[PDB]
């Protein structure tokens, strides 16, 4: 007798959810410039200031919550030589950013106006009042109102420039532009179990988890010149998973489908996997552990130059290399 789950419907094979966002990776011209964005006009902590692991030459900066927890990390990899991004299609186009309320976007609103932030008048992104702006760069960005819902380990800074009531919270909608949006819908639903919200030839909507904002996907045709990234672009989009055994069984789903992934890298503050979809899309599966305070106290999160183990035998190198990052 078939006594157990056999004949239970399940909308995917996927044996593990995926809570949300992880972080998203960009690349900047300046530090300087970039620090004084995300830091004092975003009002974001900066949560660690150290080097690409894979080019200890360059500058690698996040910013996010008083943690930098999963979820409200967006870091910067400096690179002072780059050029300008021309926009177009098979690209990471925009990131959304929580705010508890309507209220906070009229904050924020002002905030712009004050600091010369190129932004839009108040709108609507992907069904939530919102209200789109840019860095100096050309990246992309749109705040969103969360009614106050977060992911549960997000905290907001106390030493931000911001009100903690308005204080950005996390990532929410992250916005795909591709030229297969079909291609793209199947490795989102198919393979990692995303919920399709709404789908039509121009755009759809994916949540991770149904009804959250914390891992929405908005996916865009765009068909014409794929963008050429520089400075302002977008480099890859991260999701969570919960722990290295749920890496391993996304590894293995990925190359089922005949993607080719980088295998699993230790970057300390987390593992993770990178692989790349049809439309050329970067993702990386990041686990949520352990985090920036493995190697530090919350207490100094970013203030100076943190450096994986393994490079700490080059550390005189290393700075002796580096401008500092100076404080506007
Ligand atoms: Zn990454």
């Not at 239970?8 to 970039?34: C, D, P, R, W």
């Not at 106390?158 to 949006?181: D, F, N, Y």
């Amino acid at each position: 007798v078939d006594l157990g789950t056999e004949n239970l419907y399940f909308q995917s094979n996927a044996m593990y959810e995926i809570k949300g966002h992880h972080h998203i990776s960009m690349v900047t011209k300046n530090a300087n410039e970039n620090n004084h964005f995300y830091k004092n006009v975003l009002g974001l902590r900066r949560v660690k200031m150290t080097v690409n692991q894979d080019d200890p030459s360059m500058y690698h900066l996040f910013y996010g919550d008083k943690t930098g927890s999963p979820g409200t990390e967006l870091s910067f990899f400096e690179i002072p030589l780059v050029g300008r991004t021309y926009r177009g299609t098979n690209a990471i186009t925009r990131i959304g950013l929580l705010v508890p309320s309507e209220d906070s976007l009229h904050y924020w609103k002002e905030r712009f106006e004050k600091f010369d932030v190129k932004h839009s008048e108040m709108t609507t992104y992907a069904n939530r009042p919102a209200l789109q702006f840019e860095d100096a760069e050309g990246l992309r960005l749109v705040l969103l109102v969360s009614n106050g819902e977060k992911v549960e380990h997000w905290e907001t800074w106390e030493k931000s420039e911001v009100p903690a009531k308005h204080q950005i919270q996390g990532m929410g909608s992250v916005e795909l532009t591709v030229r297969r949006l079909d291609k793209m819908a199947s490795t989102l639903t198919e393979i990692f179990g995303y919920t399709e919200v709404s789908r039509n030839d121009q755009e759809a909507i994916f949540q991770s988890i149904k009804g959250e904002a914390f891992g929405e996907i908005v996916v865009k045709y765009l068909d014409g010149p794929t963008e050429k990234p520089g400075r302002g672009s977008i480099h890859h989009l991260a999701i969570r998973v919960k722990n290295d055994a749920e890496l391993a069984y996304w590894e293995e789903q990925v190359k089922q489908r005949g993607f080719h992934s980088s295998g699993i890298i230790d970057r300390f503050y987390f593992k993770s996997l990178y692989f790349r979809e049809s439309n050329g899309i970067l993702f990386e599966i990041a686990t949520d552990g352990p985090g920036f305070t493995v190697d530090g106290d919350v207490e100094h999160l970013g203030e100076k130059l943190d450096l994986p183990p393994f490079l700490e035998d080059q550390r005189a190198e290393i700075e002796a290399n580096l401008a500092p990052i100076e404080e506007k």
